[PDB]
Design an enzyme around this catalytic site. Sequence first.
Site, PDB file in Angstrom:
ATOM      1  N   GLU A   1      11.832  -8.550  -7.164  1.00  0.00           N
ATOM      2  CA  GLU A   1      10.928  -9.373  -6.471  1.00  0.00           C
ATOM      3  C   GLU A   1      11.547 -10.763  -6.239  1.00  0.00           C
ATOM      4  O   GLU A   1      11.002 -11.170  -5.075  1.00  0.00           O
ATOM      5  CB  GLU A   1       9.701  -9.432  -7.308  1.00  0.00           C
ATOM      6  CG  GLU A   1       8.434  -9.940  -6.380  1.00  0.00           C
ATOM      7  CD  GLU A   1       7.079  -9.546  -6.680  1.00  0.00           C
ATOM      8  OE1 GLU A   1       6.901  -8.832  -7.559  1.00  0.00           O
ATOM      9  OE2 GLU A   1       6.285 -10.697  -6.638  1.00  0.00           O
TER      10      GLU A   1
ATOM     11  N   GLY B   1       3.940 -11.271  -1.623  1.00  0.00           N
ATOM     12  CA  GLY B   1       4.251  -9.952  -2.258  1.00  0.00           C
ATOM     13  C   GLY B   1       2.828  -9.166  -2.469  1.00  0.00           C
ATOM     14  O   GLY B   1       1.884  -9.689  -2.999  1.00  0.00           O
TER      15      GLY B   1
ATOM     16  N   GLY C   1       8.272  -5.732  10.299  1.00  0.00           N
ATOM     17  CA  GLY C   1       7.210  -5.650  11.040  1.00  0.00           C
ATOM     18  C   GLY C   1       6.738  -6.948  11.341  1.00  0.00           C
ATOM     19  O   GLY C   1       7.245  -8.139  11.063  1.00  0.00           O
TER      20      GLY C   1
END
Lengths: 138, 138
Positions: B64, B83, B109
């Site tokens: 992470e 996240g 994206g």
Amino acid sequence: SLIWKRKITLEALNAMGEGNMVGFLDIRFEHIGDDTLEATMPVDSRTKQPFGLLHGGASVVLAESIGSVAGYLCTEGEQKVVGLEINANHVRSAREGRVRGVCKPLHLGSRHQVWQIEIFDEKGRLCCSSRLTTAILE
Amino acid sequence: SLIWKRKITLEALNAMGEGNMVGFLDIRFEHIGDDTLEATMPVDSRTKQPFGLLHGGASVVLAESIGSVAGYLCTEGEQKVVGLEINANHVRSAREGRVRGVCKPLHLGSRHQVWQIEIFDEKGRLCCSSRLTTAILE
């Protein structure tokens, strides 16, 4: 509704963490119910990301620490569990106090287990929802 | 192909973690490729579970930590990333030395990203394979 195969006190549970990550992060087991296990963890400099919020990884440390011990407590003799997969959704940030993970079984099989751990802030708001899959080793 | 939309040095990346979980776990960014980001982390008393092995949650902290920064580096201006979801497969234990996380995009994206982070032991063997899904926020 008693799921455990091993008896443990909160004291002996908390003793496990000394000198390892659980101890380092001040994860504290708080409650052993018949079918649930709860632990808390501070939102502090050791568990924050650079912007002052609880690190999503710290939530997963909490979830895996609780689920792994719950899994072990549902085995017997020299059996152990090994974590296979963990997943989590981060639904709300936390910035202070302690968060609480509440772990319950989804599956207690002869070969695998699945644990659900939900992590809440001090106001009882869901911050992270996680699942851990373990294998039982003989 | 060059995926980054911001310029940053390793020194600046490493400064981010000072006084928070990344710094406290000695997570260190080591390499910025055109489409890859790498950081390492020690297997020691700060990142071990009670049986001497790398804690699976520590792998997720590493994943992470890398993925969140990678995500940020592929946005622009006042955009940031958050996240949403993380998953990880624990496939080999680690016991000593440092592990190395290697983060590459699965999808970039305009509004969400998907990152893959593979974590290898000091001998180059795969220990954890993780995905992080982020949202891009204006």
